[PDB]
Structure formats: C-alpha cells, structure tokens
DNA sequence: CCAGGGCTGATCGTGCAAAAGTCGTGCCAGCCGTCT
C-alpha cells in the first residue's frame, strides 16, 4: 500500500536477467551501495561456398556481378527469397531483360548441392532429375507428374491421379519412389548448427526420491554497503553532505533488505507447487493433476498474488527436466475417478496413442474418446478434437497413404 | 620388445648413418604390430526448443 | 537528578478486489467412404 515498497515487492516478479540489469541500473545512483584465444576459426556454408564456385567458372564482369545478386538472395534454409523479376529490377538496367539473367540464374542450378537456389519447389525437383542417367526406368513418368498433376499427389488420394494421367497402379507407384527419393530442400545439405539455450534457478536436492528448497547458486546480487564511503557520514562537512549520505544509506539499507527478502520467499517457495504435483515428474508426463494458483496459496502459508509473482519467470531445473513455474498452471477436466484431469494430459495421451496405432487405418476422435473412457477418464469428444488440432497434428483420415 | 637377428654391416647405403634396415620377413611374420583403440564420443546437448 | 509527556525518525505490514484468459463442452457446418 506503499510506494517505497509497492515496487520493492513487484521487483521480483521478473526474470533474474532483468533484475540484474535494474539492479545495475540503480547501482550507479548510490555511491555507498556497491556489489589469449582470438583463434575463432572461420567456415563456409552455401553463401561463401556458393560464392567460391562462382569465381572458378568463366563468368564475365556483367555476369559475375549478376551472379552475386542471386547467390546472395539464397535463403540458408533452402531456396531463394525474392522473385526473378525482382532481381532484374535490382540490377538497375533497362537493356538487360529476363533472358540475360535467366542464363546466369540457370547456370548456378548446377553447382555444389544440385538444386541450390531453385525457387518455387517444382523447378528444384525437376532439375535434380535432369542430371540423372536417362537410362532410368521411371524417368519419363516422374517428369510427367513433376510438370503437372502435383496437387493430387500432395493429397492423401492417389487412385484419381492414376486414372486421369494414364498411369497404372504398379509402375507409377514405383515412379513415386523415384520422386520420393529425391530430397527437396537441397539448400540445407551444407548446413549445420551449434547452439545452447539453457537457464538455471532452483535445482534439485535428490534426497530419497525427493528434490526441494535446495540452495541458491548465482542469483544473489552482491549488495554490501560500502565501508570506505560510509566512514564519512558522521564527519560530514555541511548539512547538504550529511543529508545526502544519510538518505542514500537508508535507501541502500532498504534495498539490501528487500533483496534479501525476495530471495528467501522464492527460496523455500519451490517445494509446494511441485509437491502438490508429484505425478507429472515421478510417474511421467501423462499422469498429471489439475493445479491452480488459487489452490496453491491455499496449501502454502501465503497470499495468491504473493505466490503468483514469485513463481513467474522462475525456470526450475531437476535432473528430470527444466520447466518454468508458470507453465505448470492447468485448467480442469472431470474424470470421476478419484481426481480431475488436465488438457495437457489429453494432448500427451492423444499424441502417444496416435504414435501407437495402425499406420494404414488411422485412430480417431470418437475412438479416442472411447479409449479414454476405457482407461477411466470420461472426457468430451471436443476437448480431444481441440487438443489434436492445437498440436498441428494433421487429420488422421488425411494422414493415410499407400501401405 | 622382441628378439631380432642383427648384423653390423653397410648395405647399399641404406644404413648410412643411423637408419635400421628391416627385412620383409619382419612385416610378414606380423612382428612389431601394434593395436590402437582410439575412441571418440558424441553428446546429446538437449536444447530448450 | 530521575521519571512522565510530547516530537519525531524508523519500521513495519509483502496485501486485495478488479478485468481478462482458459478450457469443459455443446452446437453447427463441411467433407468423404459406401450402397443403393
């Protein structure tokens, strides 16, 4: 209900990154508050490698210049970004038509990774079939279904495709295999990664099947009042100086104490939500109870907001996995079996059940609802439909193909 | 090591200063053959995505 | 000189109701496999 405190207790509802940052932000204001290997080896990857080939070949000044323009618009993931006409306009010419650029852009189609800088899928695959041996049984078939009738192929249906395009069920299917064993997205062939992405907070204790309030590693912003500057307080020269020093000291003590207060709160706060939830970890990701913040403040010795703020932006970590405290929040779901359920558990089960099914005859919604009722979960058919279509799981009736 | 029949003599300047001439019957008899069990390892490095 | 009253700096409380997000769950529309 306080200013000098209303924030001193909202200053923790953020991540430790920002906290450190704002702590530095206010670490300059208060004088008395304080806390080789240059061998970076380089590489290539279809930008420099693509450019590398450019030089070796015999391309004239006007052609070389153009080459870089198109070799630089090649998105790393696979194909180029902008259209072809774009490229003609970004040369800055009027005498140069598409034909001139066509060649230069056609010549590159056959470099390191055959199919690099293709644009609009079809051209890529089509080219790849050109460098193949013409003494290939499904050469003409594949090509015929590459220039046209691709939409149908893309669909789950294939019978309507063969009947119209003068194709048989036996040979044509095998032509598919030569189009299927053809690798679109050749641009990632010479691609690779080397990332990390990991944050620490409250770890695990691992004591007789239990992880807890453990300890704090590196998250406490060293806030020790300076003693060389504090000695001059009592022996201040003017009134100005004394006032200054005392104001800054009191605010420093305030901040010391608020930082220490924030630590402890979240320190032992990481042992009741996660305990009220001893099924998602031990048993697994399937086996999950519904939990609510309102119910968490009821279990623990504190207010709802108090606990909501501590838990927000606090990535937890157990040898079983690292998930943010706020992500544990789940709605409700009647079950009638000694405890309600959650929709995340619906989603994981839908997914593990679509994984273990017949590949040719797909599983479904009413079927999934019935399976759930068999195990004793009793949910709606909608919740399943929603949780299925939320995970970008394609329709299972459209996921069928030729076994 | 191993026992080997030696003979201190110049031989067409192949033992010129300090080079040791070796017969073909030493490679054939599988003599002085060593094994080398080097072993690399790939991690997992689980990300956040 | 000591205890009673007034002034003032220190020190607290880390809470609480209000507006929005979330899924149980029902309704409703479009689409395809099959027998007529």
What was the elucidation method?
cryo-EM
Measure A26 CA to C14 C1' (Å). 21
Report CA A75 to chain centroid distance, whole Å.
20
Q: Are A369 and A379 in contact (CB under 8 A)?
A: yes
Q: Please, which contacts does A209-214 make with residues 24 or more away whose CB atoms are closer than 8 Å? A: A209/A282, A211/A274, A211/A318, A211/A319, A211/A320, A212/A270, A212/A271, A213/A267, A213/A268, A213/A270, A213/A271, A214/A270
Measured between alpha carbons, how far is A126 from A123 in angstroms, rounded to an integer? 5
- Asked if A50 and A74 count as a contact pair (C-beta separation under 8 A), the reply is yes
3-state SS assignment for residue B10: coil
Give the resolution in Å.
3.4
Return the axis-axis angle of helices A304-311 and A239-267, rounded to nearest 10°.
Answer: 90
Question: What gap in Å lies between CA A175 and CA A182, rounded to an integer?
Answer: 11
Q: Record the tokens describing residue A19, joined without a space.
A: 């906290």
Burial A68-96 (b: 16+ CB within 10 A, else e): ebbbebbeeebbbeeeeeebbeeeeeeee
Distance A6 CA to C7 C1' (A): 28
User: Which among A392, A387, A388, A280 is positioned nearest to A325, based on CA atoms?
Assistant: A280
C-alpha distances out from residue A171 to A150, A175, A287, A363, Å? 17, 7, 48, 30
CA-wise closest residue to A377 among A293, A290, A273, A277: A290
Give A199's contacts in chain B (Cβ within 8 Å).
48
| Interchain contact, B45 vs A197, CB within 8 Å | no
Q: Chain B contacts of A195, Cβ < 8 Å?
A: 47
- Say how many Å lie between the first and final Cα of chain A, rounded: 68
State the DSSP code for B18.
Answer: S
Distance A262 CA to C17 C1' (A): 24
Say yes or no for a CB contact (<8 Å) between A198 and B47. yes
Which B residues in the span 1-49 are in contact with A, Cβ-Cβ below 8 Å? Answer: 45, 47-49
| Residue A377 φ then ψ, to 5° | -125, -30
Residue in chain A closest to B48 (alpha carbons) equals A197
């Amino acid at each position: 209900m306080t200013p000098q405190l209303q924030q001193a207790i909202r200053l923790l509802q953020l991540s430790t990154l920002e906290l450190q940052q704002e702590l530095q932000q206010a670490l300059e204001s208060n004088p008395l508050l304080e806390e080789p290997v240059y061998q970076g080896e380089t590489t290539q990857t279809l930008q420099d490698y693509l450019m590398w080939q450019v030089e070796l070949t015999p391309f004239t000044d006007t052609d070389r210049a153009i080459a870089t323009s198109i070799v630089d618009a090649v998105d790393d993931t696979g194909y180029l970004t902008i259209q072809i006409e774009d490229i003609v306009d970004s040369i800055g010419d009027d005498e140069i038509g598409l034909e001139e650029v066509e060649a230069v852009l056609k010549r590159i189609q056959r470099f390191d990774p055959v199919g690099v800088a293709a644009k609009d899928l079809r051209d890529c695959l089509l080219i790849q079939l050109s460098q193949f041996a013409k003494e290939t049984p499904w050469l003409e078939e594949a090509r015929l279904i590459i220039s046209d009738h691709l939409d149908l192929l893309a669909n789950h249906d294939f019978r309507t495709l063969m009947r119209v395009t003068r194709l048989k069920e036996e040979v044509l299917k095998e032509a598919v295999n030569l189009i299927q064993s053809l690798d679109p997205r050749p641009g990632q062939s010479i691609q690779t990664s080397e990332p990390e992405y990991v944050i620490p907070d409250v770890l695990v204790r691992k004591v007789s099947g239990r992880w807890t309030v453990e300890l704090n590693a590196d998250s406490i912003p060293r806030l020790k009042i300076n003693q060389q500057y504090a000695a001059m307080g009592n022996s201040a020269r003017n009134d100005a100086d004394g006032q200054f020093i005392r104001s800054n000291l009191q605010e420093a003590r305030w901040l010391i104490k608020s930082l220490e207060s924030r630590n402890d709160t979240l320190l032992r706060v990481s042992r009741c939500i996660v305990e009220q939830q001893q099924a998602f970890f031990e048993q697994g990701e399937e086996y999950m109870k519904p939990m609510v913040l309102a119910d968490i403040a009821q279990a623990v010795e504190m207010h709802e907001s108090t606990i909501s703020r501590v838990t927000t932006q606090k990535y937890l970590h157990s040898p079983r996995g690292i998930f943010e405290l706020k992500y544990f929040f789940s709605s409700h779901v009647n079950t009638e079996g000694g405890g309600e359920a959650s929709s995340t558990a619906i989603r994981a089960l839908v997914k593990k059940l679509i994984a273990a099914e017949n590949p040719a005859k797909p599983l479904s919604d009413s079927k999934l609802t019935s399976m759930l009722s068999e195990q004793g979960i009793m949910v709606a058919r909608r919740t399943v439909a929603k949780y299925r279509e939320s995970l970008s799981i394609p329709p299972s009736n459209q996921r069928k193909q030729l076994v | 090591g191993q026992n080997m029949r030696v003979a201190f003599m110049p031989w067409n300047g192949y033992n010129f200063e300090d080079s040791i001439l070796v017969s073909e019957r030493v490679v054939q008899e599988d003599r002085f053959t060593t094994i080398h069990i080097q072993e690399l390892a790939c991690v997992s490095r689980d990300t956040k995505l």
